[PDB]
Design a protein around this motif. Structure first.
Motif, PDB file in Angstrom:
ATOM      1  N   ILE A  79       2.239   3.805   1.771  1.00 60.47           N
ATOM      2  CA  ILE A  79       1.827   2.427   0.406  1.00 60.47           C
ATOM      3  C   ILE A  79       1.039   1.415   1.262  1.00 60.47           C
ATOM      4  O   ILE A  79       1.443   1.027   2.423  1.00 60.47           O
ATOM      5  CB  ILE A  79       2.479   1.897  -0.569  1.00 60.47           C
ATOM      6  CG1 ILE A  79       3.613   2.919  -1.590  1.00 60.47           C
ATOM      7  CG2 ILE A  79       1.862   0.902  -0.986  1.00 60.47           C
ATOM      8  CD1 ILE A  79       4.740   2.093  -1.458  1.00 60.47           C
ATOM      9  N   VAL A  83      -0.675  -1.540   3.421  1.00 54.77           N
ATOM     10  CA  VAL A  83      -0.617  -2.883   3.187  1.00 54.77           C
ATOM     11  C   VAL A  83      -1.417  -3.976   1.825  1.00 54.77           C
ATOM     12  O   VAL A  83      -0.955  -4.862   1.110  1.00 54.77           O
ATOM     13  CB  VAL A  83      -1.457  -3.861   4.392  1.00 54.77           C
ATOM     14  CG1 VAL A  83      -0.348  -5.416   4.354  1.00 54.77           C
ATOM     15  CG2 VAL A  83      -1.305  -3.146   5.662  1.00 54.77           C
ATOM     16  N   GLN A  84      -2.765  -2.606   1.264  1.00 49.45           N
ATOM     17  CA  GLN A  84      -3.372  -3.640   0.385  1.00 49.45           C
ATOM     18  C   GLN A  84      -2.384  -3.628  -0.837  1.00 49.45           C
ATOM     19  O   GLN A  84      -2.792  -4.618  -1.418  1.00 49.45           O
ATOM     20  CB  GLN A  84      -4.607  -3.061   0.001  1.00 49.45           C
ATOM     21  CG  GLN A  84      -5.377  -3.020   1.353  1.00 49.45           C
ATOM     22  CD  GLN A  84      -5.586  -1.916   1.782  1.00 49.45           C
ATOM     23  OE1 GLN A  84      -6.331  -1.390   1.711  1.00 49.45           O
ATOM     24  NE2 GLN A  84      -5.033  -1.543   2.750  1.00 49.45           N
ATOM     25  N   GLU A  85      -1.964  -2.444  -1.400  1.00 50.25           N
ATOM     26  CA  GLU A  85      -1.358  -2.610  -2.689  1.00 50.25           C
ATOM     27  C   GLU A  85       0.412  -3.476  -2.911  1.00 50.25           C
ATOM     28  O   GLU A  85       0.144  -4.104  -4.021  1.00 50.25           O
ATOM     29  CB  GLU A  85      -0.672  -1.060  -3.179  1.00 50.25           C
ATOM     30  CG  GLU A  85      -1.746   0.071  -2.164  1.00 50.25           C
ATOM     31  CD  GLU A  85      -2.725   0.198  -3.908  1.00 50.25           C
ATOM     32  OE1 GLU A  85      -2.054   0.061  -4.819  1.00 50.25           O
ATOM     33  OE2 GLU A  85      -3.711   0.609  -3.735  1.00 50.25           O
ATOM     34  N   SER A  86       1.158  -3.553  -1.342  1.00 49.59           N
ATOM     35  CA  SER A  86       1.990  -4.068  -1.365  1.00 49.59           C
ATOM     36  C   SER A  86       2.970  -4.080  -0.508  1.00 49.59           C
ATOM     37  O   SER A  86       2.396  -3.417   0.349  1.00 49.59           O
ATOM     38  CB  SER A  86       3.089  -4.163  -2.407  1.00 49.59           C
ATOM     39  OG  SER A  86       2.949  -2.106  -2.167  1.00 49.59           O
ATOM     40  N   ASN A  87       3.492  -5.236   0.152  1.00 50.65           N
ATOM     41  CA  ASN A  87       4.557  -5.260   1.135  1.00 50.65           C
ATOM     42  C   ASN A  87       5.958  -5.275   0.750  1.00 50.65           C
ATOM     43  O   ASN A  87       6.112  -5.533  -0.610  1.00 50.65           O
ATOM     44  CB  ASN A  87       4.046  -5.434   2.157  1.00 50.65           C
ATOM     45  CG  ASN A  87       4.629  -7.389   2.215  1.00 50.65           C
ATOM     46  OD1 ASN A  87       3.604  -7.363   1.334  1.00 50.65           O
ATOM     47  ND2 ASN A  87       5.066  -7.923   2.234  1.00 50.65           N
ATOM     48  N   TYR A 127       4.256   7.244  -6.611  1.00 55.79           N
ATOM     49  CA  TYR A 127       4.994   6.992  -5.935  1.00 55.79           C
ATOM     50  C   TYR A 127       6.182   6.248  -5.651  1.00 55.79           C
ATOM     51  O   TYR A 127       5.816   5.404  -6.250  1.00 55.79           O
ATOM     52  CB  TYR A 127       4.216   7.166  -4.208  1.00 55.79           C
ATOM     53  CG  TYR A 127       5.479   6.907  -2.886  1.00 55.79           C
ATOM     54  CD1 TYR A 127       6.480   7.627  -2.664  1.00 55.79           C
ATOM     55  CD2 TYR A 127       5.511   6.016  -2.421  1.00 55.79           C
ATOM     56  CE1 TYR A 127       7.386   7.176  -1.910  1.00 55.79           C
ATOM     57  CE2 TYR A 127       6.682   5.308  -1.884  1.00 55.79           C
ATOM     58  CZ  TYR A 127       7.272   6.768  -0.956  1.00 55.79           C
ATOM     59  OH  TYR A 127       7.832   6.331   0.461  1.00 55.79           O
ATOM     60  N   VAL A 156       3.957   2.690  -6.186  1.00 51.78           N
ATOM     61  CA  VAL A 156       2.389   3.572  -6.210  1.00 51.78           C
ATOM     62  C   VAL A 156       2.170   3.773  -7.111  1.00 51.78           C
ATOM     63  O   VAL A 156       2.605   4.579  -7.509  1.00 51.78           O
ATOM     64  CB  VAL A 156       1.423   3.071  -4.577  1.00 51.78           C
ATOM     65  CG1 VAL A 156       1.763   4.511  -4.298  1.00 51.78           C
ATOM     66  CG2 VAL A 156       0.720   2.441  -5.052  1.00 51.78           C
ATOM     67  N   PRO A 207      -3.288   4.103  -6.401  1.00 54.16           N
ATOM     68  CA  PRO A 207      -3.440   3.372  -4.927  1.00 54.16           C
ATOM     69  C   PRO A 207      -4.365   3.435  -4.707  1.00 54.16           C
ATOM     70  O   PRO A 207      -5.742   4.518  -5.148  1.00 54.16           O
ATOM     71  CB  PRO A 207      -2.689   4.329  -3.790  1.00 54.16           C
ATOM     72  CG  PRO A 207      -2.231   5.829  -4.132  1.00 54.16           C
ATOM     73  CD  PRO A 207      -2.733   5.509  -5.941  1.00 54.16           C
ATOM     74  N   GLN A 208      -5.528   2.778  -4.006  1.00 52.52           N
ATOM     75  CA  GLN A 208      -7.167   2.596  -4.259  1.00 52.52           C
ATOM     76  C   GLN A 208      -7.317   3.327  -3.032  1.00 52.52           C
ATOM     77  O   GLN A 208      -8.345   3.859  -3.576  1.00 52.52           O
ATOM     78  CB  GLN A 208      -7.409   1.148  -3.458  1.00 52.52           C
ATOM     79  CG  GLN A 208      -7.271  -0.635  -4.364  1.00 52.52           C
ATOM     80  CD  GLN A 208      -6.651  -1.194  -2.966  1.00 52.52           C
ATOM     81  OE1 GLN A 208      -7.515  -1.793  -2.309  1.00 52.52           O
ATOM     82  NE2 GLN A 208      -5.804  -2.334  -3.565  1.00 52.52           N
ATOM     83  N   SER A 252       7.518   5.525   6.822  1.00 52.92           N
ATOM     84  CA  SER A 252       7.160   5.059   6.099  1.00 52.92           C
ATOM     85  C   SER A 252       6.787   4.588   4.736  1.00 52.92           C
ATOM     86  O   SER A 252       5.942   4.294   4.904  1.00 52.92           O
ATOM     87  CB  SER A 252       7.190   2.918   6.921  1.00 52.92           C
ATOM     88  OG  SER A 252       7.868   2.607   6.451  1.00 52.92           O
ATOM     89  N   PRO A 253       7.503   4.415   4.270  1.00 50.42           N
ATOM     90  CA  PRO A 253       7.067   4.267   2.278  1.00 50.42           C
ATOM     91  C   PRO A 253       6.379   2.918   1.949  1.00 50.42           C
ATOM     92  O   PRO A 253       5.236   2.985   1.915  1.00 50.42           O
ATOM     93  CB  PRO A 253       8.356   4.170   1.545  1.00 50.42           C
ATOM     94  CG  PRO A 253       9.420   4.212   2.286  1.00 50.42           C
ATOM     95  CD  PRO A 253       9.078   3.647   4.141  1.00 50.42           C
ATOM     96  N   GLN A 254       6.230   1.720   2.712  1.00 50.11           N
ATOM     97  CA  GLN A 254       5.604   0.378   2.776  1.00 50.11           C
ATOM     98  C   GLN A 254       5.571  -0.278   4.315  1.00 50.11           C
ATOM     99  O   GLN A 254       6.529  -0.728   4.404  1.00 50.11           O
ATOM    100  CB  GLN A 254       6.305  -0.044   1.510  1.00 50.11           C
ATOM    101  CG  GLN A 254       5.796  -0.935   1.162  1.00 50.11           C
ATOM    102  CD  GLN A 254       6.448  -1.377  -0.599  1.00 50.11           C
ATOM    103  OE1 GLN A 254       7.906  -1.977  -0.260  1.00 50.11           O
ATOM    104  NE2 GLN A 254       5.648  -1.708  -1.523  1.00 50.11           N
ATOM    105  N   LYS A 255       4.786  -1.404   4.425  1.00 47.46           N
ATOM    106  CA  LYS A 255       5.010  -2.036   5.199  1.00 47.46           C
ATOM    107  C   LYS A 255       6.248  -2.845   5.135  1.00 47.46           C
ATOM    108  O   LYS A 255       6.814  -3.153   4.009  1.00 47.46           O
ATOM    109  CB  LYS A 255       3.758  -3.226   4.990  1.00 47.46           C
ATOM    110  CG  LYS A 255       3.499  -4.345   6.123  1.00 47.46           C
ATOM    111  CD  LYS A 255       2.901  -4.411   7.007  1.00 47.46           C
ATOM    112  CE  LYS A 255       2.573  -5.410   8.522  1.00 47.46           C
ATOM    113  NZ  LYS A 255       1.592  -6.530   8.152  1.00 47.46           N
ATOM    114  N   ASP A 256       6.748  -3.607   5.886  1.00 48.53           N
ATOM    115  CA  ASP A 256       7.638  -3.874   6.220  1.00 48.53           C
ATOM    116  C   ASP A 256       9.237  -3.111   5.519  1.00 48.53           C
ATOM    117  O   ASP A 256      10.312  -4.390   6.167  1.00 48.53           O
ATOM    118  CB  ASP A 256       7.757  -5.545   6.202  1.00 48.53           C
ATOM    119  CG  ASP A 256       7.150  -6.170   6.321  1.00 48.53           C
ATOM    120  OD1 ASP A 256       6.169  -5.942   7.361  1.00 48.53           O
ATOM    121  OD2 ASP A 256       5.879  -6.783   6.077  1.00 48.53           O
TER     122      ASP A 256
END
Ligand SMILES: CC1(C)[C@H](C(=O)O)N2C(=O)[C@@H](NC(=O)Cc3ccccc3)[C@H]2[S@H]1O
Ligand SMILES: [Ca+2]
Lengths: 207, 557
Positions: free
Chosen positions: A188, A190-194, B190, B229, B232-233, B243-247
């Motif tokens: 995913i 970063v613009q979608e979400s974190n 996802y 998500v 997604p754009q 990784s799935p996602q930031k942080d």
């Protein structure tokens, strides 16, 4: 009608089950599995419950002990006893279908028993709901969703603090096994979400 | 395990395309099992591991689904406090509590049975006990108590007809698994499903917590926290155990990391190359990624920088030019056994030498051996699973990024020396090692290719067939054990969904008593090798038009 199960196999032998209720749908699925993969399924059953040494001998004792030590079978059993009747019919129908084909195999073993049974010297027994559930639990859960190396991590951090001192040891542990790395490519964007949570990264449970 | 889902805005001649390549290793008979289920609310087709009730890979004519391993941290170890006065008890919330236990007897063919005990606390089964520190370690899983709910969620999700019905079931799957969704309208989605613990403040999830009570989990986090998500754009969803996602934090395994070097980038490059992809181009991603050396992209820049002032005759320089001229794609020579280019062996020897000089050297023995693998280690049966960037190479990639890396280099892995010098010394070792084995003429070097083996022992190491049933393929391919593709609203067909798969060696594992193997025992093996695939039927008319046999049973419960 209610009792009828139609099985159709395509040109690659792939089975399509037609039935009118949950028990019968899953019964056809267990039946065709028993036809196509009996020996593999028997052996996956023994692998997931740690009963391999019973047919293969001493080289599999340790492995069977390690499987039994990694789960608590009565708890799985208590989860199956809590199922609604519709959900239990998925696992009962599946075990009963297999059993229908296994019963035919042991009645005419001379033409129907997988050759591997004769090679490894034993014959297949019937299945129950718990066994079907453990094929899944023993693979997906107890093996593919069960990974931790925390005791080894703590031994690494200990050696790092012994080589570099407490603070540098801990920062070197954070260099080798970071908690998070912002440059990681994420599924995913970063613009979608974190992910909104922040974690401790200095072992403060024992501070 | 990989997956790429292409939504409406990225697909060509279709509104969505899902291509999945779940990697569990390769077995005979097939790891997965092809099955279509029609009635009692189901209408589905696909294949699934060990013939679970729930299909992991498939579709129902409205939506499609697939999975890759999650690798979230859903497991923690609790250090239980024991006492030599009260054997079998541990301290929890101020009281000495009795351990649960059970005896087990291992029966042994032609040997003596052995009996042993399994102990369990409120935090899970005991893994090991240190009688020297009166400490027992219990392994706590966040999904404990939800394994059967998880199997059922993977089965009930096959009835969903939209994102909201499907995520209601994603929400009940408690293991750490990435699930993917695509549908006839071209929506894609996802969810990193699973149960994750709500840990107390201060709890570092990579290391054990006291089991005396204050560090117990507060409960589980809600589904709203699971990374997810929908449409997604970017127009696409790609994953290769990254990784799935930031942080979001990875599994605590020391050898597993999500960092700037990730093999998922090879999928991104291919999806971003062209504005849109057809289903044939999306399927072609399997072929390309399965042959793509994963270290080239990471280390070629550092190698080009270290050698850029060298003369033409320097061999350090000529190894890097050979790499520069390559796209990283391995192809067999006509012998069926060496690769056309020597680049992977060059990168393997260089990398092995770089790790020894850098990360390995910074880590105390015996933990140093965890960072010495280059990622190319294999048997003559070939890799037992997917190939990845090794843990040490991901750490070395941060160091060679310098202050482009967000990870503080607490220890300089190059120990005070210029990185260029270390790169060049590793290159000197590579030249020496490889020129000793093959000669000084790099262009005739015929390095060995990795091979692929459908093992007769399942992934546990246990026979699931006789050893002669093992099957062998010349070309190792870093791809799914099975591959499946679903296309939604194709503009080249009126069908809402088209779908294909490949389950090798074959659907059937049956061998008759006289040794006669089934007709479907090995008819998908060549298809697998050549990147081919066969149609998956869903509708009654398609199934009947491709019917080979049929049976009708009459059964009373
Ligand atoms: C931790 C593991 C033992 C192993 C590893 O890295 O040591 N992993 C895989 O190969 C990867 N497996 C898969 O991706 C297979 C999979 C699992 C669930 C759903 C789809 C695909 C994980 S686990 O096996
Ligand atoms: Ca953990």
């Amino acid at each position: 009608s209610s009792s009828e199960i139609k099985i159709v196999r395509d040109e690659y032998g792939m089975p399509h089950i037609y039935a009118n209720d949950t028990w019968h749908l899953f019964y056809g699925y267990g039946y065709v599995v028993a036809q196509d993969r009996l020996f593999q399924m028997e052996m996956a059953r023994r692998s997931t419950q740690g009963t391999v040494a019973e047919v293969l001998g001493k080289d599999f004792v340790k492995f069977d002990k390690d499987i039994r030590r990694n789960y608590w079978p009565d708890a799985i059993r208590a989860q199956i006893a809590a199922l609604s009747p519709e959900d239990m019919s998925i696992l009962q129908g599946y075990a009963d279908g297999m059993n229908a084909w296994i019963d035919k195999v042991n009645t005419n073993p001379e033409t129907l028993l997988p050759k591997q049974f004769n090679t490894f010297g034993f014959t297949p027994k019937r299945w129950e709901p718990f066994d079907v559930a453990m094929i899944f639990v023993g693979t997906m859960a107890n093996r593919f969703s069960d990974s931790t190396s925390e005791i080894d991590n703590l031994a690494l951090l200990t050696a790092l603090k012994d080589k570099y001192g407490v603070s540098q040891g801990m920062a070197v542990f954070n260099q080798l096994k970071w908690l998070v790395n912002p440059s990681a490519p994420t599924t995913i964007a970063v613009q979608e979400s974190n992910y909104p949570l922040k974690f401790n990264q200095q072992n403060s449970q024992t501070a | 395990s990989n997956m790429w889902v292409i939504g409406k805005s990225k697909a060509q001649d279709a509104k969505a395309i899902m291509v999945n390549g779940p990697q569990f290793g390769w077995y005979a008979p097939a790891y997965t099992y092809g099955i279509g289920l029609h009635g009692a609310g189901y209408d589905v087709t696909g294949n699934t591991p060990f013939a679970y009730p729930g299909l992991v890979f498939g579709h129902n004519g409205v939506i499609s689904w697939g999975s890759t391993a999650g690798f979230g941290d859903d497991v923690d170890i609790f250090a239980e406090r024991l006492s030599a006065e009260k054997p079998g008890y541990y301290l929890h919330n101020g009281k000495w509590v009795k351990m649960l236990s059970r005896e087990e007897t291992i029966t042994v063919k032609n040997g003596q049975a052995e009996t042993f005990t399994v102990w369990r606390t409120v935090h899970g089964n005991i893994l090991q006990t240190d009688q020297t520190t009166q400490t027992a370690y219990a392994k706590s899983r966040a999904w404990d108590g939800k394994e059967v709910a998880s199997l059922l969620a993977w089965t009930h999700q096959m009835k969903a007809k939209n994102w909201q019905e499907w995520t209601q079931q994603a929400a009940k799957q408690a293991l750490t698994i990435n699930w993917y969704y695509a549908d006839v309208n071209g929506n894609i989605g996802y969810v990193h499903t699973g149960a994750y613990p709500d840990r107390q403040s201060g709890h570092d999830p990579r290391l054990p917590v006291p089991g005396t009570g204050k560090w117990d989990w507060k409960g589980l986090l809600p589904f709203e926290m699971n990374p997810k998500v929908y449409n997604p754009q970017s127009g696409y969803i790609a994953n290769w155990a990254n990784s799935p996602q930031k942080d979001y934090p990875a599994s605590d395994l020391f050898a597993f990391l999500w960092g700037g070097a990730d093999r998922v980038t090879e999928i991104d490059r291919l999806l971003e190359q062209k504005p849109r992809l057809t289903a044939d181009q999306a399927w072609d991603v399997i072929r390309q990624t399965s042959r793509q050396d994963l270290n080239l992209r990471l280390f070629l820049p550092t190698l080009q920088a270290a050698t850029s002032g060298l003369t033409q005759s320097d061999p350090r320089r000529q190894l890097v030019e050979t790499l520069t001229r390559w796209d990283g794609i391995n192809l067999l020579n006509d012998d069926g056994k060496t690769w056309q280019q020597p680049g992977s062996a060059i990168l393997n020897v260089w990398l092995t030498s770089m790790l020894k000089r850098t990360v390995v050297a910074a880590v105390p023995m015996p933990f140093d051996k965890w960072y010495s693998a280059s990622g190319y280690e294999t048997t003559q049966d070939g890799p037992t699973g997917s190939l990845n960037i090794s843990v040490g190479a991901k750490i070395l990639y941060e160091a060679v990024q310098g202050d482009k890396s967000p990870i503080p280099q607490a220890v300089d892995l190059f120990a005070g020396k210029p990185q260029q010098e270390v790169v060049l010394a590793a290159l000197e070792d590579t030249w020496e090692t490889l020129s000793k084995r093959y000669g000084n003429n790099v262009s005739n070097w015929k390095t060995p290719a990795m091979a692929l083996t459908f093992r007769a022992n399942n992934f546990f190491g246990v026979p699931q067939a006789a050893a002669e049933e093992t099957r062998h393929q010349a070309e190792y391919q870093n791809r799914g054990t099975e591959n499946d593709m679903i296309v939604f609203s194709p503009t080249t067909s009126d069908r809402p969904v088209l779908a294909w798969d490949v389950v090798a060696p074959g659907q059937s594992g049956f061998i008759a008593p006289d040794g006669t193997v089934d007709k479907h025992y090995e008819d998908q093996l060549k298809m697998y090798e050549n990147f081919g695939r066969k149609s998956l039927w869903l509708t009654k008319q398609d199934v009947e038009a491709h019917k080979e046999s049929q049976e009708v049973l009459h059964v009373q419960r």
